[PDB]
Enzyme design. Sequence first.
Site: not given
Length: 372
Positions: A24, A33, A145
Amino acid sequence: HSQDLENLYFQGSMNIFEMLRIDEGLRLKIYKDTEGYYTIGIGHLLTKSPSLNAAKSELDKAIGRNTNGVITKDEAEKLFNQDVDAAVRGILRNAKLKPVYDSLDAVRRAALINMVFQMGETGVAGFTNSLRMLQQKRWDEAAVNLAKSRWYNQTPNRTKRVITTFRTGTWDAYKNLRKKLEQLYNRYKDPQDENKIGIDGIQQFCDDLALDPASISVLIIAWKFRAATQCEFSKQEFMDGMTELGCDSIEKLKAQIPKMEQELKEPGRFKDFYQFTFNFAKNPGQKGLDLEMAIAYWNLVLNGRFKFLDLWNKFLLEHHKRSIPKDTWNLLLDFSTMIADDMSNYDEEGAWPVLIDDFVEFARPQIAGTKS
Ligand SMILES: CCN1C(=O)[C@@H](NC(=O)c2cccc(C(F)(F)F)c2)[C@@H](c2ccc(F)cc2)c2c(CN)nn(-c3ccccc3)c21
């Protein structure tokens, strides 16, 4: 003190903080932000208030000192570790996530926490089949998966590393990422200053990206890297930029350039870019921007956008040497936005810079000539 990082020295050096630093990114100064809210560290929301002083007040309460909006990396880890504790409490009262979390080793727990930071508890709990595979230690099947999911399509490079962590139970993906970025940075770093990429490195960087070193695309990249000054590219800028852009290779960065260019199609984003250019171009030791340098950057960023750019050039080339202040730079864009094709709507009482007042007067002979 409870939050002292010395209390974690028994752990490995690689940890959830360093993991999210890679996935991040880490910001040591207050910023807004995506939603416009004051944030710091690794995604630590300070307040929804529009007041920066309100944000600093909350930061001082959490850090324990008058920070004036700037913290250290260690302070950011203390803040992050508090957020991790809260996230783990939430996982442990979630009926869908507690069983898998309890079953996982410490490294794979970090991977699950990573997911919860990115998409929240409800998002992670939706991976019913993959979570069962993880709880049954069917690592390779869980990895396959998870790669089929929209998560993978949203953030493929971060998701690949988290999946590898589930597959192997090791930090290999993060060791490999760090080494990739270090070796790429070493291709460009100044041989006489390891802390920056110099003029020669920036040239090699542009060559590797197949960019003309005088093209606006280079300045757009500098903007996305939040570069502080032209002709220098700090190690922190390079690492923070590659992290925020999700790139660990030149090929990936090359593919990102058109997305950066497209972002500029928004007037709000072009305004941010335009204002960034002033601080970037200015000599750090000066308060204003030399007129000759201002002209050079104005011609780069305003050509095709400012309908009087050619007359602006003629005007300035007859003026005396001056230092352009930030306010004058910024208001030129506002002038360009509002001004009529014949300047007939200029408001002399609008508190424009004297430079722009004088420009409107100077353009009179030209405007009248074209009308005749
Ligand atoms: C393209 C315009 N431009 C820059 O963008 C400047 N960027 C940067 O220093 C810079 C800093 C940090 C990170 C990065 C990045 F890698 F992340 F992007 C870049 C600078 C330049 C230097 C070397 C080049 F290889 C290409 C461009 C430079 C100079 C140096 N004299 N002139 N100049 C200029 C100005 C106006 C008109 C024409 C040319 C520029």
